[PDB]
From TrEMBL:
Family: Belongs to the AB hydrolase superfamily. Epoxide hydrolase family.
Boundaries of every AB hydrolase-1 domain copy: 39-316
One Pfam family hit: Abhydrolase_1
MF terms (GO), sorted A to Z: hydrolase activity
SUPFAM superfamilies recorded: alpha/beta-Hydrolases
Protein name from the UniProt record: Predicted protein
Keywords: Hydrolase
Family matches, as Gene3D superfamilies: alpha/beta hydrolase
InterPro entries in the record: AB_hydrolase_1 (IPR000073), AB_hydrolase_fold (IPR029058), Epox_hydrolase-like (IPR000639)
Annotated coiled-coil segments of the chain: none
Superkingdom assignment: Eukaryota
Amino acid sequence: MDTSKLKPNDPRVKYETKQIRGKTYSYILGEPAGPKLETVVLVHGWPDMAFGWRHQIPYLMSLGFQVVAPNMLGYAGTDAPRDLSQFTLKSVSADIAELARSFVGQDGQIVLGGHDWGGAVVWRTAYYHPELVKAVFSVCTPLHPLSAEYKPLEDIVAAGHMLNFKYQLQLKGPDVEARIQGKDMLRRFFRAMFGGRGPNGEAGFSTSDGVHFDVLDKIGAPPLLDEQELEYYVEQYALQEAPELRGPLNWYRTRELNAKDEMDRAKNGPPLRFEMPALFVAASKDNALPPAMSKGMDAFYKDLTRAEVDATHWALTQAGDEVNRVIGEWLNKALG
């Protein structure tokens, strides 16, 4: 079994869709050699896609796992609904649950893994569907408590709080959606998002201000992608109807809707408590999600394993082999 990373359109896996809760969901499906131990569902974040797990998918396949990696709502081959209520963590968790059970049956269980917004999704999925989730891991994204209040993000950062999230103001607004349209702009956007820099070292993205439009034309080749991978991201994102980033950006437009769901659960529903085995992999050089942010996370878990890898936010790829080892060892203990 070839365990090297997936290449664009890699033939070792299948590219399928299913109807899931009223939406077409596209996904990568990888089969193990021999009888499957478990099914693992992997959930990417922004601005990534299923192919973001290209290091992990063949590795997990070779460990005996069936792997299902969806392009999440709004991304690539998957539908991007107009309604923002479809993009809430709760609605997407329910999508994941139905997708999972279309593979393991209604009584079955899965292993669940996430990164970035995907990490937020898998903690919520394990909270909303503990029947289904046998073990759960997140890379980079720590647990956040159930929202007890809603304040507009503008007011939070104007008071000097959550400053490392201020880029989300730009993302939820009109500017990125309007300006980043078509393959050529998408290409520049991805060189910026994956670490490319201009002739004078200017970054194409910051956690303070978001996408630096003036820089994009001058942004060079990202260290974190080769040319073919970069082109695959462009082509898959171009599957969306222009403005192509509407779907992906809708993930930043749900704070009020999410807060409404979670204030309800904070008051009426069960407490945030994970009984099943859980893993959090922190990334040392993570700008957007610094490890310090996972402060008192351990209190919510019966069985949390912490790990750390030296990488930026893009740890799945930049530190693929190390991330694979951490997951492999944890999964071995968690299942055995």
